[PDB]
Design a protein around this ligand. Structure first.
Ligand code: NA
Length: 310
């Protein structure tokens, strides 16, 4: 009665004092921004609330080796470019596969890449790149690889990388908000020297393999699962699942089906997926195949899922 106002008044003070998203009810609707960076899965886009990754923000994506985290980041890179943006890849790992990147949709030719000498240089170069104003996205691969110059010069010992990140991030956060650039930090499972990244990041994503998809004895890629453990732009703790196919990446068509049935926009009478009276396919694969062959209906289904949600 008289509490609902005192609560709303307190929530408003918190919002004004520390910014939007400082407090949220988990049932709240996502507040929709002008532009986001789609992730490649509509499922993940919905779990993120705002339909993609936020701009001008620190994003962390973490998981075990060979989990899908990079693939997810490369899809962000592909989508940012497809919207006419520029991308940079700060590489301290040296594992990137550009052919794979190509098949996801990355314009590798125009992808700025840097292979820095030290952890500080990696972040400095990231910073100069961001302050330009010309960059839509920058991926850092990865936190664990940002080894301190001192350590690489064989020279203080404990906490130097953690201090290197904290400092870098303090400066970088402003540059990002001002520039509108998204910075994805990839991280192996304070897991890496990213005790600080945990607090600077506006989105944190936990990526994992759930089960290997099969096509006989030799299968195909994996069913991936992402939890949005931190989300300052929409209520957190949302999970999403989607498929990553070896050589292809995230099955956009697969996420449309799943979320299609989830929303009742697609009906599954037996093994037959149907859409607005028409049949899509028998079994998931045929329905998936039907959607790549007919991009018109795929976009049709995508348009309908977005409307129903945001
Ligand atoms: Na790769």
């Amino acid at each position: 009665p008289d509490r609902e106002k005192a609560l709303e008044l307190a929530v408003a003070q918190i919002e004004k004092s520390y910014g939007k998203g400082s407090v949220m009810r988990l049932g709240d609707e996502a507040r929709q921004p002008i532009s986001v960076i789609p992730t490649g899965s509509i499922a993940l886009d919905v779990a993120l609330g705002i339909g993609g990754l936020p701009r001008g923000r620190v994003i962390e994506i973490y998981g075990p080796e060979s989990s899908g985290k990079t693939t997810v980041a490369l899809h962000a890179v592909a989508n940012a470019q497809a919207a006419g943006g520029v991308a940079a890849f700060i590489d301290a790992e040296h594992a990137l596969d550009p052919d794979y990147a190509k098949k996801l949709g990355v314009d590798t030719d125009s992808l700025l890449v840097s292979q820095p000498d030290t952890g500080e240089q990696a972040l400095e170069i990231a910073d100069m790149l961001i302050r330009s104003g010309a960059l839509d996205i920058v991926v850092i691969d990865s936190v664990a690889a940002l080894v301190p110059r001192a350590e690489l010069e064989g020279e203080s010992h404990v906490g130097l990388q953690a201090r290197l990140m904290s400092q870098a991030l303090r400066k970088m956060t402003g540059a990002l908000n001002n520039s509108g650039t998204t910075a994805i930090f990839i991280n192996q499972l304070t897991t890496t020297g990213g005790k600080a990244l945990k607090f600077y990041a506006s989105v944190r994503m936990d990526v994992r393999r759930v089960e290997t998809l099969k096509d006989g004895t030799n299968a195909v890629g994996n069913r991936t699962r992402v939890k949005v453990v931190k989300n300052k732009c929409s209520p957190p703790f949302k999970q999403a699942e989607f498929d990553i196919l070896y050589g292809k990446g995230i099955s956009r068509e697969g996420s449309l089906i799943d979320m299609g049935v989830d929303q009742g926009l697609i009906r599954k009478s037996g093994a037959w997926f149907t859409y607005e009276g028409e049949q899509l396919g028998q079994g998931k694969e045929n329905a998936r195949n039907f959607l790549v062959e007919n991009a018109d209906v795929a976009d049709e289904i995508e348009k309908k899922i977005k409307e129903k949600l945001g």
